[PDB]
Amino acid sequence: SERIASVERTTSETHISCTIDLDHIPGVTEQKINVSTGIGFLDHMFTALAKHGGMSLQLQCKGDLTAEDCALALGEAFKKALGERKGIKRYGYAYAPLDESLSRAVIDISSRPYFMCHLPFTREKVGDLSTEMVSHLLQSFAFAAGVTLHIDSIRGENNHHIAESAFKALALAIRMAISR
Amino acid sequence: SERIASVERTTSETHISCTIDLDHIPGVTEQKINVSTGIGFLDHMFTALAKHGGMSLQLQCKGDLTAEDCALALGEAFKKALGERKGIKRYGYAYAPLDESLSRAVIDISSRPYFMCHLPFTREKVGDLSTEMVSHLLQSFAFAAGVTLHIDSIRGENNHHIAESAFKALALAIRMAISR
Amino acid sequence: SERIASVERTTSETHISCTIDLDHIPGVTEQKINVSTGIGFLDHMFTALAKHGGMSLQLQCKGDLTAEDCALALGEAFKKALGERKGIKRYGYAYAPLDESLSRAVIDISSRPYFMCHLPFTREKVGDLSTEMVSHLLQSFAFAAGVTLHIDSIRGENNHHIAESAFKALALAIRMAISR
Numbered sequence: 001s002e003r004i005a006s007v008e009r010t011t012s013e014t015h016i017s018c019t020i021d022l023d024h025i026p027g028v029t030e031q032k033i034n035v036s037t038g039i040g041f042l043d044h045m046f047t048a049l050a051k052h053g054g055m056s057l058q059l060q061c062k063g064d065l066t067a068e069d070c071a072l073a074l075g076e077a078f079k080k081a082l083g084e085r086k087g088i089k090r091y092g093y094a095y096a097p098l099d100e101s102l103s104r105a106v107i108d109i110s111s112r113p114y115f116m117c118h119l120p121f122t123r124e125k126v127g128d129l130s131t132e133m134v135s136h137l138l139q140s141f142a143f144a145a146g147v148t149l150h151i152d153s154i155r156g157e158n159n160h161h162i163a164e165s166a167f168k169a170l171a172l173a174i175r176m177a178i179s180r
Numbered sequence: 181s182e183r184i185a186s187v188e189r190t191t192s193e194t195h196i197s198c199t200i201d202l203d204h205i206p207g208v209t210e211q212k213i214n215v216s217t218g219i220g221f222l223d224h225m226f227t228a229l230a231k232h233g234g235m236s237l238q239l240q241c242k243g244d245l246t247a248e249d250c251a252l253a254l255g256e257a258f259k260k261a262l263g264e265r266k267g268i269k270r271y272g273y274a275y276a277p278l279d280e281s282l283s284r285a286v287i288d289i290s291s292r293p294y295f296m297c298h299l300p301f302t303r304e305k306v307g308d309l310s311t312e313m314v315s316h317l318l319q320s321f322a323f324a325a326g327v328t329l330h331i332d333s334i335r336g337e338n339n340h341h342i343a344e345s346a347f348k349a350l351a352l353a354i355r356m357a358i359s360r
Numbered sequence: 361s362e363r364i365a366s367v368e369r370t371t372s373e374t375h376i377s378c379t380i381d382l383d384h385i386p387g388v389t390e391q392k393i394n395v396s397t398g399i400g401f402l403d404h405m406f407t408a409l410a411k412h413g414g415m416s417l418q419l420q421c422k423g424d425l426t427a428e429d430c431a432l433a434l435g436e437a438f439k440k441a442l443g444e445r446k447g448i449k450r451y452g453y454a455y456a457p458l459d460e461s462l463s464r465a466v467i468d469i470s471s472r473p474y475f476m477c478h479l480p481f482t483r484e485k486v487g488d489l490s491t492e493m494v495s496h497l498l499q500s501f502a503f504a505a506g507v508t509l510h511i512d513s514i515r516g517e518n519n520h521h522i523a524e525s526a527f528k529a530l531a532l533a534i535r536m537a538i539s540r
C-alpha cells in the first residue's frame with residue numbers, strides 16, 4: 001500500500017499544488033519528479049530532495065511571481081502520506097558531500113515538530129534563491145511535516161554546495177527514516 | 181537461536197537481577213521491558229535503551245535505596261547474551277535527536293572495553309538521578325559489556341534531553357552493531 | 361556478476377600489481393587478502409581497508425624499496441571493478457572507533473574525484489610509514505578511484521589509532537556505498 005498524498009492551496013496571488021509518493025513498486029514502478037516553483041534554485045533543491053529521498057513528487061506553484069509556502073505544502077503532503085507512520089525506522093541520519101562541502105541531517109519522524117540548523121552561508125542569494133531563506137524553508141518543511149530535524153553544514157565554501165549537500169543529506173536521512 | 185542471558189547479584193544492602201534478550205521472533209514474539217532501579221530517571225533511560233535497541237530487558241534492583249552497579253549488571257548480561265559475537269555487524273553508529281538536543285553514539289562490539297564521552301550537563305541532577313553519574317553509568321555499561329563506546333552530545337540545552345538523546349543514540353548504535 | 365579488476369604497473373625501479381574483488385558469493389566464497397607494499401604499517405592499513413570494506417585484495421609492490429603509487433593502483437583497480445556503478449547505494453558514511461580514537465568517512469561514489477580531510481597527527485612517522493603521507497595516500501586513492509571523499513579524525517591521541525580508525529571508517533563507508 002503506497003503512501004501517497006496530495007495538497008492544493010489557492011490565494012488571490014498564488015496557486016500551489018503538490019502530490020507526493022513515498023514508495024514505488026520495485027522493478028514495476030519508478031520515481032517521477034516535476035518541480036516548478038518559479039525559483040530555479042529551489043526547484044533544484046526540492047528535486048534533489050525527492051530523488052535521493054526515494055520519493056516521487058509533483059510540485060507546481062503558479063501565479064505572478066513567499067517560497068516558504070511551497071516548503072509548507074511539501075511538508076504537509078509528506079506528513080499526510082506518512083499517515084500512520086506504522087512500521088517505519090523512524091530515526092534517520094545521513095551525511096552527503098558535494099565536492100568541498102559536507103552536510104549532515106538527523107531526523108526523527110515522530111509527531112514533534114522541531115528544527116535546529118547550522119548553515120553558514122556567505123553570499124546573499126544562491127542563484128535564483130536567497131540564502132537566508134534556506135534555513136527558513138527547511139524549518140517550514142520540518143514544522144509542516146511534523147518532524148524533528150537537525151541540519152548541519154560540517155564544512156563548505158560554495159553556498160550552492162552547502163545548500164545542495166544539505167538537501168541531499170536531508171533526503172538520505174528521510175529515505176532511511178521512512179523505510180519499512 | 182535467541183541471544184539471552186541472566187545475571188543476579190546480592191549484597192547485604194542490595195539485590196540486583198537482570199535478564200536480557202537481544203532478539204525476537206519476527207511477527208511471533210515481541211519486546212518486553214520492565215525496569216525498576218529505585219531511580220525514576222535511570223529507569224526511563226534504561227527503558228529507552230532497551231526499546232530503541234530492539235532488546236527485551238528485565239532489570240530490578242531491590243533493597244534499602246551505587247546505581248553504577250545496575251549499569252554493570254546490564255553490561256554483564258549484554259555481554260553474556262552477545263556470547264560468541266559471530267555474524268554480527270560489530271560496528272554501529274547512530275544519531276538521535278530530542279527536540280533541541282542531538283547526540284551520537286559509536287560502538288565497536290569487540291572485546292576491548294573503552295569509553296570516551298562528551299556530555300556537557302548544566303544542572304546537578306536530572307530528575308531522579310545525578311547528572312555527573314550519567315557518564316559513569318555509560319562507562320560502567322561499556323566496561324562491563326566489554327565494548328568500545330564513544331558518546332557525544334552534539335548540542336543540547338535541557339539536561340534531560342541531552343541524557344535521553346544519548347541513551348537513544350546508544351540504543352540505535354547497539355541495534356545496528358548486534359544485528360546479524 | 362562479481363566486480364573484479366586487475367592493474368599492473370612497471371618502472372625501472374618498481375613493479376606494482378593489484379587485483380580487487382568487490383563481492384563474494386555468500387556462503388560459497390570468502391574474502392582473501394594479501395598486501396605487501398614494503399611498508400609494514402601501510403600493509404596493515406590497506407588490509408584493514410579491504411577486510412572491513414568487504415573486499416578481496418591482492419596488492420604487491422616489489423623492487424628496491426613513492427607509496428602514493430600503490431594507493432593510486434588500488435584506487436585504479438577499485439574504479440575499474442566498480443565499472444558501471446549501476447544499482448549501488450552510491451553514498452556511504454561510517455564512524456569507526458579504536459580505543460581512544462574516533463574517525464568518520466563520507467564517500468560519494470560518483471565520478472567526481474574530491475578529497476577533504478582533517479587528520480591531526482602528532483609524530484613524524486607511524487611505525488613503518490610517515491604520517492604526513494597518510495592524507496596523501498587517501499587523496500591518491502580517492503583521486504584514482506574517482507570518488508568524493510571526506511575523512512575526519514573526531515578525536516585521537518595515538519597516531520597509529522588515528523590512522524587505523526580512519527582506514528576502518530573509510531572501509532565501512534565504502535562497504536555501504538558499493539552495496540547493491
Ligand code: EMC
Pocket residue numbers: 037038039061066067068069070
Ligand atoms: C515562490 C516560490 Hg513557491
Ligand code: EMC
Pocket residue numbers: 115116117118135139
Ligand atoms: C531556526 C533554527 Hg536553524
Ligand code: EMC
Pocket residue numbers: 217218219241246247248249250
Ligand atoms: C540505585 C539504583 Hg540500581
Ligand code: EMC
Pocket residue numbers: 295296297298315319
Ligand atoms: C570517562 C570518559 Hg566520558
Ligand code: EMC
Pocket residue numbers: 397398399421426427428429430
Ligand atoms: C613503497 C610502498 Hg608501494
Ligand code: EMC
Pocket residue numbers: 475476477478495499
Ligand atoms: C588535501 C586535503 Hg586532506
Ligand SMILES: [Hg+2]
Pocket residue numbers: 014037038061062063065
Ligand atoms: Hg510560484
Ligand SMILES: [Hg+2]
Pocket residue numbers: 194217218241242243245
Ligand atoms: Hg535499588
Ligand SMILES: [Hg+2]
Pocket residue numbers: 374397398421422423425
Ligand atoms: Hg615496493
